[PDB]
Structure formats: structure tokens, C-alpha cells
Amino acid sequence: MVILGVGYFLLGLILLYYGSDWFVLGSERIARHFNVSNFVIGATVMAIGTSLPEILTSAYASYMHAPGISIGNAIGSCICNIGLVLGLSAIISPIIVDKNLQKNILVYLLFVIFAAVIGIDGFSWIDGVVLLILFIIYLRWTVKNGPSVVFSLVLLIIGLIGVLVGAELFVDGAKKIALALDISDKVIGFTLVAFGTSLPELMVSLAAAKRNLGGMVLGNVIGSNIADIGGALAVGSLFMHLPAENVQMAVLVIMSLLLYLFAKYSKIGRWQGILFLALYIIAIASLRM
């Protein structure tokens, strides 16, 4: 059995490391035959693709009459996107923050503090429909202020496809292997899920940062978080009311904040993502692990 798991792990791991580029590559090749800042493409199309599964999980999950999943993990996916994903991706390649976007960084922030407050009461369908709306509003907005275009499209798709699929196979594999070692859990596997579902977001962000394209990294991180909220989470609330995770919410803000700091106020990189990590570290160290 383990065999097939291992065969997944690799076969995944490869597609992961390849799609991450191919998607980032093909995405930018669109971005520059379409005029959008290597940011915005990441903040829209790429944030969608990466967060695309966590939506279909979130929809399905809350409908299974057990919607605690659709929220508390949809946040780790944001916290990770900053604390870990953005945290590290800074260290490798510092990201330039020009006046064109720090208004946007702050706009994203409001979305957090908004969703954050309206979350204490949990998330009625109402509580949720606002978000899909704002989510859309945020898009036509962020988007308006940014036969050769054939190939790129393929790369984007196939890259994307490969990422998401690889992550499944990878995870699929790394699981059986993890059990074949006899150290199982519905909590390590979990710690490795609030952490291991933005695995795509992680890669596509790292593989972009590999190529000194911080606009993508940021946009990817900013947008995915919104997608995790305005898109994914909010679809969960449609089916059922979602419980209050106000603690993990409290953190997201603090994290989402230190982010806004080094935006209109300074630049991000090496020596900060350390703190994010340190912060992402201390977060897990005592969070709904």
C-alpha cells in the first residue's frame, strides 16, 4: 500500500515544483501582454487558483453538517499565507512597495477587520453574502487599477492543474507514508492541514519569489487571504451558520497588520519575515493546533 503512497508523494512533489513555476510563468506572460501589475495577476487569478480547492472543501464541508472545518482552517490558510508563506518568501526576496498598491494593502486590511468584527456573532448566510459581494467589489476595483497570448494561457492552466493535483497526490502520499511509519493522528495530520491546505499558495508564492517577483508574492498572499475569506469561508456560511473562532481571528488581524506596516510605511523582506515566522511559530505553539 505504502508503495502507492510513495509513488504519489514523488509524482506529486514533481508536479508541485513544476506547476508552481509554469503557473507563475504563464501567469506573468499574461500579465505583460495584458498590462496588469505582476501583483494584480497574483492578487486575482493566482489567488483564486491557489485557494480554489479550499473553496470546494469549504462548500462541501459545512454542508456535511460539520462546518467548524469551513472556518478555523480557512483562516490558518490566511495566517500561513502571511506568517509562513509571505514570511519566508520575503526572506528569500524582499518586495518593493510603490504608492500604487499600499492603498490596496490597506483596503485589504479593512476587509479583514470588517469580516473580523462581523464574525463574533458567527456567520449567518447574511453575514456571508456581504462578503461574496465585497469580494467581487474588491476585484473589479483592484483589477481596473493595474495569438502570442495563447501559450501563456496553457502554461497558466497546466501549471495550475499540475500544482493542485500534485498537492493532492503529494498529501495523499505523505499520508500513507506518515501512517506506514506508525505515528498517526487526527491532529498531526490536522496541524499539517490548517498548515497544509495553502500548500499550493505556499509553492506558487515561493516559486514566484524564486524569480524576484514580489508583486506576485504579495498579491498572491493578499488575495488568497481574501479568497479564503470572501470566497471560501463565505460559501460555507451559505449552507450553515459558522461558529466564532474569534481567537484565531484576533491573530489574523495582528498578522494582517504588521503586514500593512511595512507597506506604505516601509519595505518587506529578509529581516521581517523572520518575525512572521517567529510569529507563525509562536502562533501554532498555542493555537487550535
Side-chain angles (χ1 to χ4, degrees), residues 211-223:
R211 322 183 155 235
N212 296 310
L213 269 173
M216 268 201 174
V217 172
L218 203 63
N220 213 92
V221 162
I222 299 301

PDB file of all heavy atoms in Angstrom, residues 211-223:
ATOM      1  N   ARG A 211      12.030  33.954  -8.354  1.00  0.00           N
ATOM      2  CA  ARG A 211      12.361  34.732  -9.537  1.00  0.00           C
ATOM      3  C   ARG A 211      12.240  36.238  -9.313  1.00  0.00           C
ATOM      4  O   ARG A 211      11.981  36.986 -10.256  1.00  0.00           O
ATOM      5  CB  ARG A 211      11.458  34.309 -10.692  1.00  0.00           C
ATOM      6  CG  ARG A 211      11.195  32.821 -10.724  1.00  0.00           C
ATOM      7  CD  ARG A 211      10.357  32.441 -11.925  1.00  0.00           C
ATOM      8  NE  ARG A 211      10.564  31.048 -12.303  1.00  0.00           N
ATOM      9  CZ  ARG A 211      10.934  30.653 -13.517  1.00  0.00           C
ATOM     10  NH1 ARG A 211      11.127  31.547 -14.479  1.00  0.00           N
ATOM     11  NH2 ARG A 211      11.104  29.362 -13.771  1.00  0.00           N
ATOM     12  N   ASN A 212      12.426  36.668  -8.066  1.00  0.00           N
ATOM     13  CA  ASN A 212      12.432  38.089  -7.718  1.00  0.00           C
ATOM     14  C   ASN A 212      11.228  38.858  -8.268  1.00  0.00           C
ATOM     15  O   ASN A 212      11.386  39.852  -8.977  1.00  0.00           O
ATOM     16  CB  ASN A 212      13.736  38.747  -8.183  1.00  0.00           C
ATOM     17  CG  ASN A 212      14.961  38.194  -7.470  1.00  0.00           C
ATOM     18  OD1 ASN A 212      14.994  38.107  -6.242  1.00  0.00           O
ATOM     19  ND2 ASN A 212      15.974  37.812  -8.243  1.00  0.00           N
ATOM     20  N   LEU A 213      10.030  38.380  -7.944  1.00  0.00           N
ATOM     21  CA  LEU A 213       8.794  38.992  -8.424  1.00  0.00           C
ATOM     22  C   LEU A 213       7.828  39.232  -7.278  1.00  0.00           C
ATOM     23  O   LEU A 213       6.710  38.716  -7.277  1.00  0.00           O
ATOM     24  CB  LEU A 213       8.124  38.096  -9.465  1.00  0.00           C
ATOM     25  CG  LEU A 213       8.486  38.332 -10.928  1.00  0.00           C
ATOM     26  CD1 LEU A 213       7.879  37.249 -11.801  1.00  0.00           C
ATOM     27  CD2 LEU A 213       8.014  39.707 -11.370  1.00  0.00           C
ATOM     28  N   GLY A 214       8.263  40.027  -6.310  1.00  0.00           N
ATOM     29  CA  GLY A 214       7.498  40.240  -5.100  1.00  0.00           C
ATOM     30  C   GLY A 214       6.072  40.734  -5.244  1.00  0.00           C
ATOM     31  O   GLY A 214       5.248  40.531  -4.350  1.00  0.00           O
ATOM     32  N   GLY A 215       5.788  41.403  -6.356  1.00  0.00           N
ATOM     33  CA  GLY A 215       4.433  41.820  -6.658  1.00  0.00           C
ATOM     34  C   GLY A 215       3.520  40.613  -6.648  1.00  0.00           C
ATOM     35  O   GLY A 215       2.463  40.627  -6.014  1.00  0.00           O
ATOM     36  N   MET A 216       3.937  39.563  -7.348  1.00  0.00           N
ATOM     37  CA  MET A 216       3.205  38.307  -7.342  1.00  0.00           C
ATOM     38  C   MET A 216       3.050  37.776  -5.927  1.00  0.00           C
ATOM     39  O   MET A 216       1.934  37.509  -5.489  1.00  0.00           O
ATOM     40  CB  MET A 216       3.885  37.257  -8.225  1.00  0.00           C
ATOM     41  CG  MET A 216       3.360  37.237  -9.650  1.00  0.00           C
ATOM     42  SD  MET A 216       3.652  35.719 -10.577  1.00  0.00           S
ATOM     43  CE  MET A 216       2.737  36.080 -12.075  1.00  0.00           C
ATOM     44  N   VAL A 217       4.170  37.641  -5.220  1.00  0.00           N
ATOM     45  CA  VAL A 217       4.170  37.108  -3.860  1.00  0.00           C
ATOM     46  C   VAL A 217       3.162  37.823  -2.985  1.00  0.00           C
ATOM     47  O   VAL A 217       2.346  37.192  -2.317  1.00  0.00           O
ATOM     48  CB  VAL A 217       5.535  37.263  -3.185  1.00  0.00           C
ATOM     49  CG1 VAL A 217       5.443  36.878  -1.703  1.00  0.00           C
ATOM     50  CG2 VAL A 217       6.588  36.444  -3.910  1.00  0.00           C
ATOM     51  N   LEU A 218       3.225  39.147  -2.999  1.00  0.00           N
ATOM     52  CA  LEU A 218       2.312  39.942  -2.206  1.00  0.00           C
ATOM     53  C   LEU A 218       0.885  39.689  -2.649  1.00  0.00           C
ATOM     54  O   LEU A 218       0.080  39.175  -1.876  1.00  0.00           O
ATOM     55  CB  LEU A 218       2.636  41.423  -2.334  1.00  0.00           C
ATOM     56  CG  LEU A 218       2.122  42.214  -1.137  1.00  0.00           C
ATOM     57  CD1 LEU A 218       2.821  41.734   0.125  1.00  0.00           C
ATOM     58  CD2 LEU A 218       2.328  43.701  -1.345  1.00  0.00           C
ATOM     59  N   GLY A 219       0.590  40.042  -3.899  1.00  0.00           N
ATOM     60  CA  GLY A 219      -0.733  39.869  -4.472  1.00  0.00           C
ATOM     61  C   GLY A 219      -1.296  38.492  -4.204  1.00  0.00           C
ATOM     62  O   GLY A 219      -2.446  38.350  -3.794  1.00  0.00           O
ATOM     63  N   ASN A 220      -0.465  37.477  -4.412  1.00  0.00           N
ATOM     64  CA  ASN A 220      -0.836  36.103  -4.108  1.00  0.00           C
ATOM     65  C   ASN A 220      -1.245  35.930  -2.647  1.00  0.00           C
ATOM     66  O   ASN A 220      -2.258  35.297  -2.349  1.00  0.00           O
ATOM     67  CB  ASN A 220       0.324  35.162  -4.433  1.00  0.00           C
ATOM     68  CG  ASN A 220      -0.143  33.803  -4.907  1.00  0.00           C
ATOM     69  OD1 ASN A 220      -0.298  33.576  -6.105  1.00  0.00           O
ATOM     70  ND2 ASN A 220      -0.371  32.889  -3.967  1.00  0.00           N
ATOM     71  N   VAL A 221      -0.453  36.502  -1.742  1.00  0.00           N
ATOM     72  CA  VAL A 221      -0.714  36.407  -0.308  1.00  0.00           C
ATOM     73  C   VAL A 221      -1.932  37.229   0.111  1.00  0.00           C
ATOM     74  O   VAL A 221      -2.791  36.754   0.854  1.00  0.00           O
ATOM     75  CB  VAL A 221       0.515  36.847   0.515  1.00  0.00           C
ATOM     76  CG1 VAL A 221       0.123  37.166   1.951  1.00  0.00           C
ATOM     77  CG2 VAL A 221       1.585  35.771   0.473  1.00  0.00           C
ATOM     78  N   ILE A 222      -2.000  38.464  -0.374  1.00  0.00           N
ATOM     79  CA  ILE A 222      -3.117  39.349  -0.067  1.00  0.00           C
ATOM     80  C   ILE A 222      -4.432  38.779  -0.582  1.00  0.00           C
ATOM     81  O   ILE A 222      -5.404  38.669   0.162  1.00  0.00           O
ATOM     82  CB  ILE A 222      -2.909  40.749  -0.679  1.00  0.00           C
ATOM     83  CG1 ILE A 222      -1.651  41.408  -0.103  1.00  0.00           C
ATOM     84  CG2 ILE A 222      -4.134  41.620  -0.452  1.00  0.00           C
ATOM     85  CD1 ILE A 222      -1.669  41.574   1.400  1.00  0.00           C
ATOM     86  N   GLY A 223      -4.451  38.413  -1.858  1.00  0.00           N
ATOM     87  CA  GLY A 223      -5.656  37.919  -2.495  1.00  0.00           C
ATOM     88  C   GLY A 223      -6.149  36.594  -1.950  1.00  0.00           C
ATOM     89  O   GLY A 223      -7.347  36.422  -1.717  1.00  0.00           O
TER      90      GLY A 223
END
